[PDB]
Amino acid sequence: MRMILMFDMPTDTAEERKAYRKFRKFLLSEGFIMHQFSVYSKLLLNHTANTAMVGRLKANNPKKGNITILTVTEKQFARMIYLYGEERLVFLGDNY
Amino acid sequence: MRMILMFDMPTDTAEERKAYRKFRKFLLSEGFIMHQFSVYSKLLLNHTANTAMVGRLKANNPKKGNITILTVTEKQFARMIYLYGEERLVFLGDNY
Amino acid sequence: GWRTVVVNIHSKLSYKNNHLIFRNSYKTEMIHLSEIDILLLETTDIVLTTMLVKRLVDENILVIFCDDKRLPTAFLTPYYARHDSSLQIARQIAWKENVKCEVWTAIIAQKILNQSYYLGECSFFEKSQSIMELYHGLERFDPSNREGHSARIYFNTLFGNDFTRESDNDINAALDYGYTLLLSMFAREVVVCGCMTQIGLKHANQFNQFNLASDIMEPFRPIIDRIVYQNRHNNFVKIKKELFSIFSETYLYNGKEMYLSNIVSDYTKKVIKALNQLGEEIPEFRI
Amino acid sequence: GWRTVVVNIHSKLSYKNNHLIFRNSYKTEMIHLSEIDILLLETTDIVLTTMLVKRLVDENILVIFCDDKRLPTAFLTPYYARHDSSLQIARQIAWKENVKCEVWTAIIAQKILNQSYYLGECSFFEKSQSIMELYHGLERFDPSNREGHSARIYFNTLFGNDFTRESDNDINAALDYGYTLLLSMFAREVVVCGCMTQIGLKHANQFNQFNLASDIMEPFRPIIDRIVYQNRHNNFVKIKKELFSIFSETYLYNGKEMYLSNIVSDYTKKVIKALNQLGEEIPEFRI
Amino acid sequence: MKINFSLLDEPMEVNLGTVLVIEDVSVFAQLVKEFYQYDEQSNLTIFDSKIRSIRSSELLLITDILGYDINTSQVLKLLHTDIVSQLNDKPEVRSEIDSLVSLITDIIMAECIENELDIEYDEITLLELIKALGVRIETKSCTVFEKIFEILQIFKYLVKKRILVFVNSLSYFSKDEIYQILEYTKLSQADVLFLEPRQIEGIQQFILDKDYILMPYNN
Amino acid sequence: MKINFSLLDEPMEVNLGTVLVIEDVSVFAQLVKEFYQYDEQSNLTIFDSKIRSIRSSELLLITDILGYDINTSQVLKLLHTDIVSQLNDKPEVRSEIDSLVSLITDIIMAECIENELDIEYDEITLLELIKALGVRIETKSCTVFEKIFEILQIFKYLVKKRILVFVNSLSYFSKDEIYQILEYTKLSQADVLFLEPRQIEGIQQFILDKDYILMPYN
Amino acid sequence: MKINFSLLDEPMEVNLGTVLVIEDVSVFAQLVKEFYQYDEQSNLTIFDSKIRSIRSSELLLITDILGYDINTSQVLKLLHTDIVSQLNDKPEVRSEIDSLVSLITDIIMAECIENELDIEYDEITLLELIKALGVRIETKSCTVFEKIFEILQIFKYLVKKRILVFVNSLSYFSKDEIYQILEYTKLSQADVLFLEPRQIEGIQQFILDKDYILMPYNN
Ligand SMILES: [Ca+2]
Ligand SMILES: [Ca+2]
Ligand SMILES: [Ca+2]
Ligand SMILES: [Ca+2]
């Protein structure tokens, strides 16, 4: 089960930034990889490790922190498209 | 097709904050809902609407903005779990 | 419009809310008309509506219709692009043979000079020196035919002595294809100017609707000759795709670096203004 | 080919087995390709196929597109094997000033004669006799301006002395509407002839782009002013409804009673053929 | 009752019976899938004169003619009510039935008085007599044509179904049977929409070409 | 397997995939009526390789592909019984399941004893665990081409059904999809028979003329 | 949408526009009284294809054309929603309007920041802009023909009205105007039933003779 995890929290206070660094280090220690800011994912072996990981994430969530969790297949994970910020020739048909 | 979208960008400058507000308003106008900061999702009817939405998101991405797109099933989109929040010496009081 | 839309697939096209509607069984896509410059139909299975054709005529978008072989068959020519056309017809009838032969001679000099620049970039000193000699030897009425000799020496030097323009090889086919596309864009620009396309600036005896647009498109041929020379080993399909990449690529005008469509539009505008004002300034395009 | 196929109704066009398939809600008709000569599309709801367009390119038949106003907008231009109309436009560029002045004077004489005859049908003998005197006094180059002098007499007789063409009223808007419909029909006929409508018969004013058709439609103008005189009390919408019945109404041509479309077609053909042949015969139309 | 999809230029109106022929197998299968999934997909939109979109519960979709169950609790209940109304429209027949049921009630009442226990009853009504008779429609021996005809007859009994749609049901019926189905649909006023891959000869229908052009066809 | 009716001269055999075209609308509609009424009517007969008549329970007749539910009470019963048999084939795994169920029953029993109200329980069984998990065949079908494939999978899974019959189901699929369906039928070895009003070009099929004569095609 | 009364032999169907001419003044006045009192009287019965009788709230009765109020809260609300949909169908116009509204909101926000009190706001939307503009239909200068045309245009906006009925409204309109009303009713799909004492020449209508015989009439 491919576990996609989004993480956010107000970063204004120094304690909030420290909690964000601690939570990020905890995510890296648990096997999660950061694709971009607030974007992470980890490959869970089965539903058991998934449930235990959900409990651990709920236990380690910092104050005011918010985590989104989504279950995704490998075919859907390879279809993940990341656009980081206008074509002259538009082709409708075979792309040649 | 359930589209999970993460959005990040340096917010330091005033122009960057204005661009972030504009991009967020554009995401809300397109049907995306914000589950938490940087975390959004939208239900796309089919693959064509998904491709057009990808092109539109690439066109509307602000400078230095970074977007992560992941495809999840509708049942897996409902499976989304949002969690909102080992020391030997525990101090309840002034932290010294 | 900035966008060249090419449809090689069977589908139905409609016009809805100032938007081009591409409807197919697999997917449907809407593209705004203001962004669209040129519309190219490369197959015979495409369907369109006369209302969308009227909206394309009002939007002044060039519509090209190809054959089953995908080679262009016929393009749409609007009767009235602008009200200044009816006033420009009297000026075209009032044009002088000295202005026509002068502007055409300067244009041929720009084409031969562009060929000498292409051979100079290709590091041929004798060929570019000979073509430059023919450029310095060009005269009014063209008694020496230095333009045809420059073309024969150009193609014979590039593709080999055994090569010829009358051959049926895919090289000449791609050359006629690029000349047909550039002739279509230049002809559409002449339709935007409003002047008669059938009246040429060189020979009054030759009667052809594409004569004027060819005389205006003469200096830009070496741009097609370059990609044709590089892709000559590739198949005709890949050569056609590389020819389609010319619209995406940008070229350096004397003023600044611009797109091909803008250079053709501004060049044709300066040519028409120079013809009506009797040679005030001659636009020069260099590679 | 011979027959001229015009589509005024919603329909779809296809090409099967060297046979043009025209499909309308009422019935389906199949026409051989060799029988068709010129193809014109009146409305914006017509659907066509690019394959039929390619077959038309091989058949050389001229394709004419029209807008919602029915005025012709664009026509199909093939890159090779061009139609004979493009060769016929050169004769229109060669039209002599004497033939243009003769045809123009004949047209003005026909219009003034129709106005005086209509005033005689309205039983005003003094105004019709004055307009007839101006008709017999018309001369080349128009130094007397007897047409502009007959105008005020005709309109002042019809709608009263207080009425004028410069004032803004439902009568003037109705006259411009009828002149717009007649300009659309005559302009469509001139587009069928292939001659450029920007070149006018009047040598003074080139401002209008329709000048040729606007000059050809003058002899049929009073037929609109009759219905506008009868319906003048009705609102502009009712005047438009009454003017819309002129297409269904039949009129008397010199040869036989015919519809307005065929009469305008024969008149335009005689005008073009007379201009190319330098005044063999001048078509005359009387109310 | 107008239906609209992305392939059509304008929404097409469905009045009485309507035969829609889709010459493209891809657009036909996609349209049928959009008919079964209609609540999930927004591509196919069916709206009434009020422009209000009808729910999938209001839409009636039928593919297998002999597999559909025509006998339901609501259909049999409303049918029994219709029979009770038919018997109520005739005063003489209702009077005779009242006499007979009254005699039976007298007999059963005497048998109850003969018993030692105290027994009470109310009445034997006509709806209870029909429910005891077990009146229902017979689809067992019915041919496909009679089955579709019975479906067109019970569509008036269905309250919640706004429109009836048949999928490829015209291949079984002969041209004359199709003429009877359409002519009966014009009298029943119900809205029926048939979807066929191939065009039927002799009947008015809307044809969708592989070019995605919709045209009316008399034959 | 072979099917026989009064119109045919000799019974035709149905092996792997088979396409049967009936050029008569009356014989086609009457044939479908004989398919739904097969239990009632003795006209249409089916003789297997053993030359024995089969009951209508062994015949699988499917007209609407999308309207046919894959999940049924009998299908879920046979699937749950199959999974229970697979878990019963391994003693150690079932023993571990009994241990875990014993632990959960001990926890819930302790929580029940903690409550002030008296509580009575029976036990937890593997069948109740499977039914509680909701084990069923996948209900996701994007197109009728995939739905018919699921119908072929469930048909090959069902041993009681000796034949699967489709009525006018080939009009939805494209010629290439028909080729893929025939190849999948030949790979699955199941017996499938199709009934079409008109002939299909490009594939092998048995054409029944209006003269009642049957002829092979391709 | 079939209507039935004791004088008719069979219930007559009303589809699109229908002109019903009653040649008897007694039956006409009694029928109009049964139209106003319809909830109280069981003589006149109007039912749909479901045979369900429509309530008087679902029936729309109109006699005075210029006295009827076309502007209502529901009609203006649904009309504003329709205008918002029309502005939403065009992306460019909606973008421009969003830009202008953004500028105005910036100005007002600056003015709020200049104040000493802490002020909060939300947004200025398109529906609020239309409500502030006061968009409504103008019946003041409208002719009777334009009034009935606007009524036929707003009948689609009325959700609860099942059928529109006009009482003696065809006397004011010319034959051509009646042709425009019927031809527009065929496009609007609404069900309109006109009641006139005298027959109108040139239009299809149902005539009820003093003999109480109902016959279709082409003219
Ligand atoms: Ca009872
Ligand atoms: Ca019983
Ligand atoms: Ca607000
Ligand atoms: Ca206001």
Measured in angstroms, the CA of E215 and the nearest CA of chain D are apart by 7
| Whole-angstrom distance, CA of residue C47 vs CA of residue D48 | 7
Bridge partners (DSSP) of residue C72 are C66
Measured in angstroms, the CA of E134 and the nearest CA of chain B are apart by 45
Q: DSSP class of residue E197? A: S
| Whole-angstrom distance, CA of residue E219 vs CA of residue D27 | 10
Task: Give which of D183, D189, D186 is closest to D64, Cα–Cα.
Answer: D189
Task: Report how far Cα G170 is from the mean position of its chain's Cα atoms.
Answer: 16
Closest Cα in chain D to E206: D25
Joined tokens for residue G39:
């909830």
Q: How far is the CA of E131 from the centre of ligand 2 (A)?
A: 8
Bridge partners (DSSP) of residue F216 are F206
The answer to whether G and E touch (≥3 CB pairs < 8 Å) is yes
Measured in angstroms, the CA of C27 and the nearest CA of chain E are apart by 10
| Whole-angstrom distance, CA of residue D128 vs CA of residue D212 | 28
Task: Report how far Cα G90 is from the mean position of its chain's Cα atoms.
Answer: 27
| Beta carbons of F53 and F42 less than 8 angstroms apart | no
Task: Give which of C169, E208, F115 is closest to D23, Cα–Cα.
Answer: E208
Chain E positions in Cβ-Cβ contact with residue D46 (cut-off 8 Å) = none
| Whole-angstrom distance, CA of residue G177 vs CA of residue G180 | 5
Is residue E143 located within the same domain as residue E35?
Answer: yes
Is residue F141 located within the same domain as residue F51?
Answer: yes
β-bridge pairing F59-62 and G2-4: unpaired
Tell me, what CATH number does G80's domain have?
A: 6.10.250.2340
| Whole-angstrom distance, CA of residue C90 vs CA of residue C106 | 24
| Beta carbons of C98 and C201 less than 8 angstroms apart | no
D58: Cβ contacts below 8 Å, ≥ 6 apart: none
Residue linked to tokens 């008296």: F118
B45 touches chain C (CB under 8 A): no
Within 10 A of C274 (CB to CB), how many other CB atoms are there?
Answer: 18
CA torsion through residues C259, C260, C265, C266, sign: positive
Joined tokens for residue F10:
């000799």
| Whole-angstrom distance, CA of residue C172 vs CA of residue A65 | 68
Is residue E66 located within the same domain as residue E148?
Answer: yes
E189 touches chain G (CB under 8 A): yes
Is residue F147 located within the same domain as residue F189?
Answer: yes
| Beta carbons of G152 and G194 less than 8 angstroms apart | no
| Whole-angstrom distance, CA of residue G201 vs CA of residue G217 | 10
| Beta carbons of F1 and F45 less than 8 angstroms apart | no
The answer to whether D and F touch (≥3 CB pairs < 8 Å) is no
CA torsion through residues C13, C17, C19, C24, sign: negative
Q: For E13, list phi and psi in degrees, rounded to 5.
A: -90, 140
- HEC assignment per residue over E35-47: HHCCCCCCCCEEE
F30: Cβ contacts below 8 Å, ≥ 6 apart: E143
What B26-31 contacts at long range (C-beta under 8 Å, 24+ apart), as own/partner pairs, is B26/B60, B30/B56
Q: Are E13 and G49 within 8 A, CB to CB?
A: no
E107 touches chain D (CB under 8 A): no
Task: Give which of D278, D284, D285 is closest to D95, Cα–Cα.
Answer: D278
Q: Specify the experimental method.
A: cryo-EM
Joined tokens for residue G26:
């007694």
Joined tokens for residue C60:
């002044």
Residue linked to tokens 């030097």: C157
Residue linked to tokens 């009935």: G148
Subunit partners of chain C (3 or more CB pairs within 8 A): A, B, D, E, G
What is residue F132's three-state secondary structure?
Answer: helix
Q: DSSP class of residue F53? A: B
| Whole-angstrom distance, CA of residue C48 vs CA of residue C34 | 18
Can you give the residue range of the structural domain that contains F203?
1-72+135-218
Strand E192-196's sheet: what is its strand order?
E59-62, E163-167, E192-196, E17-22, E205-208, E214-217
Is residue F83 located within the same domain as residue F6?
Answer: no
Check whether D218 is labelled as a binding-site residue: yes
| Residues near ligand 4 ion, CB 5 Å cutoff | G 134
Task: Report how far Cα E133 is from the mean position of its chain's Cα atoms.
Answer: 23
Tell me, what CATH number does F55's domain have?
A: 3.40.50.11940
Q: How far is the CA of E114 from the centre of ligand 1 (A)?
A: 21
| Whole-angstrom distance, CA of residue F198 vs CA of residue A72 | 45
| Beta carbons of B1 and B44 less than 8 angstroms apart | yes
| Whole-angstrom distance, CA of residue B17 vs CA of residue B62 | 10
Within 10 A of G22 (CB to CB), how many other CB atoms are there?
Answer: 25
Chain B positions in Cβ-Cβ contact with residue C23 (cut-off 8 Å) = none
Is residue E17 located within the same domain as residue E63?
Answer: yes
| Whole-angstrom distance, CA of residue D54 vs CA of residue C44 | 7
Q: DSSP class of residue D143? A: S
User: What's the length of chain D?
Assistant: 287
Report the number of secondary-structure helices (H) and strands (E) in chain D: 10, 10
Closest Cα in chain C to G88: C17
Within 10 A of E210 (CB to CB), how many other CB atoms are there?
Answer: 15
C-alpha to C-alpha distances, C57 to C77, D72, D155, D196, G93, nearest whole angstrom: 8, 11, 38, 18, 23
C-alpha to C-alpha distances, B10 to A36, B36, F77, nearest whole angstrom: 12, 18, 58
C-alpha to C-alpha distances, E12 to E6, E44, E50, F81, G188, nearest whole angstrom: 12, 12, 15, 51, 13
Is residue F91 located within the same domain as residue F185?
Answer: no
| Beta carbons of B27 and B56 less than 8 angstroms apart | no
Within 10 A of F26 (CB to CB), how many other CB atoms are there?
Answer: 14
C-alpha atoms less than 13 angstroms from C-alpha of D281 in its C-beta half-sphere: 8
| Whole-angstrom distance, CA of residue G79 vs CA of residue G85 | 10
Q: For C46, list phi and psi in degrees, rounded to 5.
A: -80, 140
Within 10 A of F145 (CB to CB), how many other CB atoms are there?
Answer: 18
C51: Cβ contacts below 8 Å, ≥ 6 apart: C14, C15, D44, D45, D68
Task: Give which of D9, D75, D4, D76 is closest to D44, Cα–Cα.
Answer: D9
C-alpha to C-alpha distances, B77 to B74, D138, E31, nearest whole angstrom: 5, 87, 27
| Beta carbons of D76 and D63 less than 8 angstroms apart | yes
Q: Cα C151–C269–D89 angle (5° rounding)?
A: 80
| Beta carbons of E62 and E151 less than 8 angstroms apart | yes
Q: Are B80 and A68 within 8 A, CB to CB?
A: yes
Q: Name the strand (E) or helix (H) holding G64.
A: none
Bridge partners (DSSP) of residue E45 are E4
First to last CA, chain G: 23
| Whole-angstrom distance, CA of residue B25 vs CA of residue B38 | 13
Of D48, D75, D206, which is closest to C48 when you measure between CB atoms?
D48
Of D14, D25, D49, which is closest to E216 when you measure between CB atoms?
D25
What is residue D144's three-state secondary structure?
Answer: coil
Is residue E105 located within the same domain as residue E188?
Answer: no
Bridge partners (DSSP) of residue D41 are D7
Amino acid at E51: I
Segments in chain E forming alpha helices (H): 25-36, 73-89, 91-114, 126-133, 144-154, 175-188
Task: Give which of G188, E183, G186 is closest to G204, Cα–Cα.
Answer: G186
Bridge partners (DSSP) of residue E112 are none
| Whole-angstrom distance, CA of residue C164 vs CA of residue C179 | 16
Q: Cα C212–C216–C221 angle (5° rounding)?
A: 125
Strand A33-36's sheet: what is its strand order?
A33-36, A39-43, A2-8, A66-72, B81-84
Joined tokens for residue D208:
């209008």
DSSP letters of chain C? --EEEEE-S-EEEEEETTEEEEE-SS-EEEEESTTEEEEEE-SSSEEEEHHHHHHHHHTT-EEEEE-TTSSEEEEEEES-S-THHHHHHHHHHT--HHHHHHHHHHHHHHHHHHHHHHHHHTT-HHHHHHHHHHHHT--TT-SS-HHHHHHHHHHHHHH-TT--TT--SHHHHHHHHHHHHHHHHHHHHHHHH-S-SS--SS-SS---TTHHHHHHHGGGHHHHHHHHHHSTTS-HHHHHHHHHHHHHSEEE-SSSEEEHHHHHHHHHHHHHHHHHTTSS-------
Of E9, E26, E213, which is closest to C25 when you measure between CB atoms?
E26
Task: Give which of F80, F71, F58, F36 is closest to F147, Cα–Cα.
Answer: F71
Strands (E), D120-268: 250-252, 257-259
| Whole-angstrom distance, CA of residue G186 vs CA of residue G16 | 6
Domain residues of chain D, as ranges?
1-85, 86-287
C-alpha to C-alpha distances, C156 to C150, C153, C166, C221, nearest whole angstrom: 10, 5, 12, 15
Bridge partners (DSSP) of residue F20 are F195, F206
What count of CB pairs under 8 Å joins C to G? 5
| Beta carbons of C281 and C270 less than 8 angstroms apart | yes
| Whole-angstrom distance, CA of residue D57 vs CA of residue D61 | 7
| Beta carbons of C6 and A91 less than 8 angstroms apart | yes
| Whole-angstrom distance, CA of residue C47 vs CA of residue C15 | 12
Is residue G57 located within the same domain as residue G89?
Answer: no
Of A4, A62, A85, which is closest to B64 when you measure between CB atoms?
A85
| Beta carbons of C141 and C156 less than 8 angstroms apart | no
Q: Which residues of F are annotated as a binding site for Ca(2+)?
A: 138, 150
Measured in angstroms, the CA of E53 and the nearest CA of chain B are apart by 18
Is residue F60 located within the same domain as residue F145?
Answer: yes
| Beta carbons of E195 and E32 less than 8 angstroms apart | yes
**Residue finishing a domain among F87, F112, F134:** F134
Q: How far is the CA of E121 from the centre of ligand 2 (A)?
A: 20
Bridge partners (DSSP) of residue C250 are C259
Amino acid at E97: I
Is residue F97 located within the same domain as residue F180?
Answer: no
CA torsion through residues D37, D41, D47, D49, sign: positive
Measured in angstroms, the CA of C73 and the nearest CA of chain D are apart by 6
Dihedral of CA atoms G172, G174, G178, G183 in degrees, nearest 10, equals -140
Q: DSSP class of residue E125? A: -
DSSP letters of A34-82? EEETTEEEEE-SSHHHHHHHHHHHHHHPPTT-EEEEEEE-HHHHHT-EE
Within 10 A of E159 (CB to CB), how many other CB atoms are there?
Answer: 11
Is residue E65 located within the same domain as residue E140?
Answer: yes
Joined tokens for residue C205:
């005896």
Task: Give which of B51, B1, B62 is closest to B27, Cα–Cα.
Answer: B62
C-alpha atoms less than 13 angstroms from C-alpha of E7 in its C-beta half-sphere: 23
| Beta carbons of G66 and G147 less than 8 angstroms apart | yes
Joined tokens for residue C35:
């962004």
Q: For C38, list phi and psi in degrees, rounded to 5.
A: -115, 140
| Beta carbons of G83 and G156 less than 8 angstroms apart | no
| Whole-angstrom distance, CA of residue E52 vs CA of residue E61 | 19
First to last CA, chain A: 37
Strands (E), chain D: 3-7, 12-16, 19-23, 28-32, 36-41, 47-49, 62-66, 72-78, 250-252, 257-259
C155: Cβ contacts below 8 Å, ≥ 6 apart: C163, C164, C165, C225
Q: Are F26 and E67 within 8 A, CB to CB?
A: no
Mutate to test the interface with E, among C25, C44, C45, C46 (most CBs of E within 10 A): C25
| Whole-angstrom distance, CA of residue C47 vs CA of residue F46 | 51
| Beta carbons of F12 and F2 less than 8 angstroms apart | yes
| Whole-angstrom distance, CA of residue B72 vs CA of residue D273 | 73
Measured in angstroms, the CA of D286 and the nearest CA of chain C are apart by 31
Chain D positions in Cβ-Cβ contact with residue C51 (cut-off 8 Å) = 44-45, 68
Dihedral of CA atoms B57, B60, B66, B68 in degrees, nearest 10, equals -10
Bridge partners (DSSP) of residue C23 are C12, C28
The total number of structural domains that make up chain E: 2
Joined tokens for residue D218:
């003058």
Put simply, the chain C residues between 178 and 237 with a CB less than 8 A from any chain A CB are 237
Subunit partners of chain D (3 or more CB pairs within 8 A): C, E
Task: Give which of E122, E128, E146, E124 is closest to E83, Cα–Cα.
Answer: E128
What count of CB pairs under 8 Å joins C to E? 22
Q: How far is the CA of G109 from the centre of ligand 3 (A)?
A: 13
F172 touches chain E (CB under 8 A): yes
Exposure string over E46-80, b if 16+ CB within 10 A, otherwise e: beeebeeebeeeebbbbbbbbbbebeeeebbebbb
Q: Is D150 exposed, middle or buried (0-12, 13-18, 19+ CB in 10 A)?
A: buried
Q: Is C56 exposed, middle or buried (0-12, 13-18, 19+ CB in 10 A)?
A: buried
Task: Report how far Cα A82 is from the mean position of its chain's Cα atoms.
Answer: 12
| Whole-angstrom distance, CA of residue G82 vs CA of residue D94 | 58
Amino acid at F167: V
Subunit partners of chain F (3 or more CB pairs within 8 A): E
Exposure string over B9-22, b if 16+ CB within 10 A, otherwise e: beeeeeebeebbee
Joined tokens for residue D66:
């029209």
Amino acid at G101: V
| Whole-angstrom distance, CA of residue F81 vs CA of residue G105 | 67
Dihedral of CA atoms D210, D216, D219, D221 in degrees, nearest 10, equals -20
Ligand showing the shortest atom-to-Cα distance for residue G125: 3
Measured in angstroms, the CA of B84 and the nearest CA of chain E are apart by 32
Within 10 A of F115 (CB to CB), how many other CB atoms are there?
Answer: 8
